[PDB]
Every structure is written in structure tokens, then in C-alpha cells.
Structure 1
């Protein structure tokens, strides 16, 4: 069918198999496949997710044209994702004018002004974090980060989005925590999708959701109770906004679901990659406790302004995100016949930017596998192309939650490094192995020793 498209256009790439395309090559994971394609083929190449053509690009100008210059015109949507059900209306999933509308209604939620109002609340849970860490540091029993971080990141969402305040590590079975804890793009299911994308319309008419039909109905009503218990946070910022069109009720639920997830799994996963790097680089960790103590003496509480003051803290976070950009790739569907930077791109091709591989290219990064926060010092931070280093994307469809994510993680680190130091255990996987699957997550979970200062 559409297997001859790259041979024709003169773009190189691995030869596709009938039906499967190049997907057997995902057996080492997206990231390794991207690195190898990049090395073997240069600046542009092509491959087929089943029948779907995918054009990878690594030129910073071309990348900017896709993500910024020609976003509204050509490269507006992400790869069709399904089956979604009513989550078709979630901002990260929606398309064209429905997205533009949702991006407009939801943008003022993420300003610096509202972000500054959420700091005192994310603080109270920064303490709750300490108390549950102290119990396991005074009990010299190794600690699993995703649990305690996830409990924290869960605590921050529920509060920043609905007010619900829970000790999710100590109230792990409170129902509002159950639902909310519940996508491996290389598991039995989504591989079957790529080989049978004609099956998505089938699953839709069958009221099948990759977002289980149960969790969603919990929040559809949890919201429409809160909706009627508030006028009788994120949700509030959304109800107040339905006062360019009417932000409906079920749409409001779908945004909540996307925010809940992002602020939980992404935030907690990144915070775990950081503490790993800090533990396997003891000096970096010490240097940061020194900076935190210098800006916040006597273990003083971090404020909004003192967080943006801490520069090595910023350097550490950016560097972790270099080595582990949790999105792995950025993507846009080409909606017209177009030509950008001298190259013809036909309609329907997915254009892909392989962030993970670019973050680790030796043609922009010296010793790229090494954790070296100094790359981001205000001296060298100018020698870093913002279209090579893109942990939050770029352009009108970049990560809306970027400012909040950064602030959330950094307040976690500050209140935690004030009180504790983190040391590799015996059971600590060194060096960390990335999941061979479809997620930027560790092969084995991260386990470390903790000591009260």
C-alpha cells in the first residue's frame, strides 16, 4: 500500500516488512531504534508503523518550522490515538479548532500569576513528604522512590485540582486515591493497534476506552458533586472559565483526567530519575544542599521567588531531563502537501522529532551518557540549541504544564534535601537500565538509603 513512499522520495530508512512495517525493530525500545537510525542514516530518515509513514527529522531549522513556524498551518495535531471514547476532548488529544479553543480556555490556568498562588499548598505537602521519609530513614530499611514521590505528587494534584487533601501514602486505600493511581506503547494491545489501525473505529462503537470505563465515571460524578458542592485550584479555574465557546461539563472532566495523570506519573518519575543521579554523584548532591542552605538558611521554607533563585537546582533538573526526556519523541501529523527547508513532505505523514536520541547525540553533547549538570551553567547554557534540547517540546503545542511541573518538582527537592541525604544501597541498580518497552521508565525501580541530617 504505502510502503514505497520513502524509496520514492529519496529518503533513506530500514526496509519495511509487509503489514508490520518496521515495528519489529522496537524490540530494543523506541529510544535505541531512534539512536541507531540516526547514526546509520544521518539527518533525515523514514520508517513505517505498520502502514503509517513516519519521517524522522533532526535539523534544528526544520524542527522549528514544524513545531513553531508552521504549526497552525500544517503541523497542528498529534498522531491519531485510539480508542479514546469521551476523552477525544482532552487537550493533548484534541485537534485543530477544538484544540485551539481548549488551549485558549486552559492557558490562563498555567500563568506565573496562578502558579505563584499554588505555592503555599504544594508546600504543606512538602512537609507531609518529610514525615513519611523520616519514618523510613529512622528505620534503616531501603526506600522506593516512585512510591513516596508518587504519594507526594498524587497529594499535590488532588489538591491543586479539586482541593481533596489526603495522606495518600498513609491513606493509600482512600477511594479518591485508588481510582487516580490506575500507556505502554509496546505492550500486547498497542502493537496490535499499529498493525490494525482499522480496528480503532471498531473499538469506539464498542464503547471501549484505553481509559477504563470505570475510573472515568468515578470522576465524571466526583466532579459534578464538587461542581455542586463548590458554588453551594484547577477545577475552579475551569468552572470560573466557563463563565471561544462554552466549556462543557464532560469536557471539564476530560481535562481533569489529563492534568491528574501528568502531574502524577510524569512528576513522580522525573523526581525519581533525579534522586538516582544525585545518589550516584555524591558531590552534585552535596553542592545542591549547600545552595539550598545558602538561600534557605535554618532549613527555611522555599518560596516562589527563592525557587527561581536556585540555579544549580535548575542545572540539576535540566540535566536529568536531558538524559531522560520522558516523552522520548515529539510528533505532528502533516495535514497538507508541503515543503519545509527544501524537503517535500506529503499529506498524512507523521513527522517525528526523536528527542531522546538528540539529547544523547555526541555531535552536540560531549560525553553525553555522563550526568554533568555543568552543561547548563549560565556560562555554557548559550551553547545549547533549544531545538535539540526539548524536554517540554516547543511552539504553540508545547507542554502546557511546564512551569508548574518545574516548580512542583523543585519544591519537592528543596524540602527533601534540606532534611535528608540519599545513598546507593546494595540493591541499587547501577548503572540504571532503561525499560526495553515503550516508556521512559527504569527497568528496575529505584531504591536508595536515606539518612536524617
Structure 2
């Protein structure tokens, strides 16, 4: 409670913190509502405390640019640590300073458009697997839970694009490879924020927020694949070729592989559910997209890398969905030095925070922000959108490295699925969708819809 004076001293407003707890009791409605509220109550900048940890929110796009881009390497290089990580210290998204700068370099060529175009044929084949599982549920007019069928697809793309493994997860939901990979503001991480001194305790104990079993399975599963291709197109290959030179270690390689799975599993699948919900409760947008897809790919023509970038309304739909549901919710950098940015003094050790969800729904930049209106991303209006207000993939050197992959992956899933099906609300569909009051951007109730064969 000896750090709870910091914002009062700097003249920064914020809600008054309780001893030890900081302002965390105010997460009872979740990060995003607390963010929105703070924005409205306090203005362009405010402070609060995760326990003893001062956090300064900022919403000025100049200041956001300074932090995210201009002063990334100098000052705002790392995210705030969260729990016991074990050997995953070496994962790119968790690593810090120069080890991050080295991993980011070693892994950037992996995510070029040129490597992505080579992955389209592989991400296409499981779009076909996706249709056949959906059609089995459309001919038996039973409502569908998107997260299971989309999760099966995202999961199918990940194992293929990162290791070559080819499974029909929805039908082999219990192959050993599919088991490990799916697993694990909850009672744990709040305790971490009130007792962050307990992290080094769990480290020496080898306790990990990564189930020690999943990680042991893939550490060895990778070293089998590694020594089965060596010697006799995916992320593992691209990393194995990179350490054929400063170059990527062996346990370092396992760790990035693991980050890529958590990265694109719950995210690629969660997003596709958000887009199918909006498509269902807005059937004209849904028709408008089916017309655009049939126009570029007549006769259910299979999508190609080039035809995907041809589809503008598709891009508009995806982009608007991420405005209502930016699954990061917040961006964050730890300030590593006393700094002054855009006229404001920022003391060393503050976490700086961009409240994405809240800025995506700000009426001061967005007309009717709670409404799903894709036209805001029309080539006409897309110019009047501040790229430091709309940030579903972050920005600057530490933006989402897998952005071009994620967009492509989702767009391929959509094109095939709208080439073949229409999606209609059920009586059991939650309208309007309520967001989880928990710690992830997800729906209260899972999205259930009706699927019909075109």
C-alpha cells in the first residue's frame, strides 16, 4: 500500500485503491466494463493498481504510437509477467529485451506472405473436412455449437501447419495428439496479482501454468519429428531450417511451437464464432458476402491466396467483428525507464495499457459503436479510422506476428463454409450475445445456430 500513492502524486486520476488488493475488486464485471467505465469517468488517461502494481491507461493516439512504435526498443519493450512459466520463459511472446529481439528476428521470415502463400493448399484441405462435418449436422437438422466444429477446424489447421500431423479431430477427438493440444480472472491469477511474490516460489518448484504433462509430451513429440524428418512446408520445418545457420536452440524451438498452438487455437476458433453470430443475426450482411464469394469463385470454386485478398466485403466483415470483439482486450508494455512521452512523466516500472475493447466501442471515434456495421471498413470510410484506435493485432515491433496467417486462416474457413451453408438463429441462440464477465473475450453462453445446405 506504499506504492498506492503513485498516481495521486503525479496528478493522474483513478479509482481509489484498497490495501493490498489495489482496484482488483472492480474486475467483478470484467476487464472491459471496468475499462469502459474508467474511460468515461476519468478522461484520456487514468491509473489503477493490480494489487501493488500501478497501471496507467492511455487513450491518446499520439501517445499510443509513442509507446507501441516510437519508444518500443528504447522503453516499452516487454509485456508484464503473469505467472510461473518454466522452460517457456523462451517463448517469443513471453521473452524479454534482447532475447525477444533475437527470437522475433529468427521467427519473422516464418510469417512472410511468401511462406503464407505456400500454406494455403494445406489450410484449404481441412476447409473441405470442415464442410463434411457440418453437412453431417445439417442433414440431421440439429443446431450446431460453433466452438466445437470451428475448434475442430482451427485444431486441424494448427497440427498441419506446425508439424505436418493430419487428423480429423472432430472425428478423432481422442487421438493422443489432439488431447494434449486442447488442454488449459480465475482463482489462480488474481492470487498471482495480490501475491506476485509467489511466482519465484512456483518457479523453483517447477510448477508451470503450462500443465507439465502437455509440455513434456510435445518436447518429446517434437524431438521425434525432428529426428524423423532429419533425415528422410510447416512452421517446425521453417524453424528447423532456421537453426541451420545466435540460432534457435532445441528447447527454444519446442517453446515457440507451443506458443503457436495456444495462439491460433482458441483465437482462430473464437473469432470465427463471433463472425458467424453476427452473420446469423444480420442475414443481409450474410447474403451480401455469399454474393461476393460466388462472384469471385463461381461454382463453389476453391479459394486461392490471391482470390482471398480480392474479397473486400469479406475483409470488412472480419475487420468489423474484431472491432466488437478484439480478443486481446488490452495491449500492455512495461515501462523500463523514467520517460516523458507527449508531455507526461511516466516513472520506471509502471505497466502502460491500451484499452482496446474500450476504444473499439468509444462513441467519440465510432458512430453507433454497439451496432455491427461493416460499412465502417468500406474503402470509402476505411481511411477515416485511426490505426491507433483500431488495434486488433497490436501495433509496432511487438504487434501480432501471426496476423497475416490468422486473417487468411479465418477467411479460408469462411469462404468454404458460406459457399455451402446458410446460418440462421435458433430459439436457443443468445440474442443479444452477452460477453463473459470472466477473463477472456468469449460469450457467456456458447453460440448455437441452425445450419442449412445451399
Structure 2 residue 163 is matched with structure 1 residue 159: no
Q: Secondary structure at the match of 2:423?
A: strand
Offset of 1:255 from its aligned partner?
Answer: 0.2
Gap runs ≥5 in structure 1:
none
The 3 A distance-change label for structure 1 pair 220 and 429 is: same
- 1:85 aligns to what? 86
Cα distance, 1:210 vs structure 2: 0.2
How far has the Cα of 1:81 moved from its partner? 2.2
Contact 1:101 1:244 in 2 (8 A): no
Question: What secondary structure does 1:423 align onto?
Answer: strand
TM-superposed CA distance for 1:82, in Å, is 1.7
Deviates further, 245-254 or 382-391: 245-254
Distance 1:206 1:108 in 2: 36
SS in 1 for 2:424: strand
C-alpha distance in 2, partners of 1:198/1:120? 48
Contact 1:78 1:332 (8 Å CA) reproduced: yes
Aligned residues: 451
Secondary structure, counterpart of 1:214 in structure 2: helix
Are 2:338 and 2:347, in contact at CA under 8 Å, matched by a contact in 1? yes
Distance 1:120 1:157 in 2: 14
Q: Distance in 2 between matches of 1:197 and 1:130?
A: 46
Task: Return the offset for 1:244.
Answer: 9.5
Counterpart for residue 226 of structure 1: 225
* Counterpart-to-counterpart distance in 1, 2:245 and 2:294: 47
How far is the alpha carbon of 1:246 from its aligned partner? 2.4
Residues 104 and 244, structure 1, Cα contact 8 Å, conserved in 2:
no
CA shift digits 1:193-242 (9 cap, x unpaired): 00000000000011100000000000000000000000220000001000
Distance of 2:49 and 2:180 partners within structure 1: 36
Moved more, 237-246 or 414-423: 237-246
Alpha-carbon offset, residue 278 of structure 1: 0.1
Q: Measured at CA, do residues 54 and 244 of structure 1 come closer, stay the same or move farther in structure 2, by a change above 3 Å?
A: farther
Partners of 1:165 and 1:263 in 2: how far apart? 17
Looking at structure 2, the residues matched to 446 and 415 of structure 1 have their Cα atoms a distance apart, in angstroms, of 20
Q: Which stretch has the larger CA shift, 393-402 or 236-245?
A: 236-245
Deviations 1:47-106 (A, max 9, x none): 000000000000000000000000000000000122100001000000000000000000
| Structure-1 separation of matches of 2:190 and 2:230 | 45
* Preserved CA contact (<8 Å) 2:158 2:265: yes
Query: Aligned in 2, Cα 1:422/1:281: closer, same or farther, shift over 3 Å?
Result: same
Residues 260-287 of structure 1: CA distance to partner in whole angstroms, max 9, x if unpaired?
1111110000000000000000000000
Instruction: Note the alpha carbon deviations across 1:387-423, whole angstroms, 9 max, x for none.
Output: 0000000000000000000000000000000000000
SS in 2 for 1:82: coil
SS of the residue corresponding to residue 209 of structure 1 reads coil
Cα distance, 1:358 vs. partner? 0.0
CA contact (8 A) 2:83 2:189 kept: no
Q: Could you tell me how far apart the structure 2 residues matched to 1:376 and 1:246 are? A: 41
Q: Deviations over 1:322-371 (max 9, x none)?
A: 00000000000000000000000000000000000000000000000000
Aligned partners of 1:246, 1:394: CA distance in 2, in Å? 26
SS of residue paired to 1:235:
helix
- Where does the alignment leave 5 or more consecutive residues of structure 2 unmatched? none
CA contact (8 A) 2:106 2:247 kept: no
Select between 246-255 and 42-51 the one with higher mean Cα deviation: 246-255
List 4+ stretches of structure 1 deviating above 6 A: none
| 2:369 partner SS | coil
- Secondary structure in structure 2 of the residue aligned to 1:118: helix
Residue 416 of structure 2 aligns to a residue in which SS? helix
Q: Look up the SS of the partner of 1:192 in the other structure.
A: helix
> TM-score, normalised to structure 2's length?
0.99
C-alpha distance 431-235 of structure 1, shift in aligned 2 (>3 A): same
SS in 2 for 1:291: helix
Task: Provide closer, same or farther for how the CA distance between residues 256 and 348 of structure 1 changes in structure 2, counting only shifts above 3 A.
Answer: same
Q: How far, CA to CA, are the matches of 2:248 and 2:408 in structure 1?
A: 27
Contact persistence 1:299–1:418 (CA under 8 A): yes
Cα deviation for residue 188 of structure 1 reads: 0.4
Contact 1:355 1:391 in 2 (8 A): yes
CA contact (8 A) 2:338 2:348 kept: yes
Give yes or no for contact 1:333–1:351 (8 Å, CA) kept in 2.
yes
Distance 2:227 2:264 in 1: 25
User: Retained in 1: the 8 A contact 2:293–2:311?
Assistant: yes
Per-residue CA deviations over 1:121-151 (Å, capped at 9, x if unaligned) read 0000000000000000000000000000010
Q: Secondary structure of 2:333's partner?
A: strand
Asked if 2 retains the 8 angstrom alpha-carbon contact of 1:116 and 1:304, the reply is yes
CA distance in 2, matches of 1:162, 1:244: 21
CA distance in 2, matches of 1:306, 1:61: 36
C-alpha separation in 1, matches of 2:334 and 2:194: 18
- The Cα offsets for residues 168-208 of structure 1, whole Å up to 9 and x where unpaired, read as 000100000001011xx901000000000000000001110
Work out the CA distance in 2 between the residues paired with 1:137 and 1:82: 43
State the secondary structure of the residue aligned to 1:418. Answer: helix
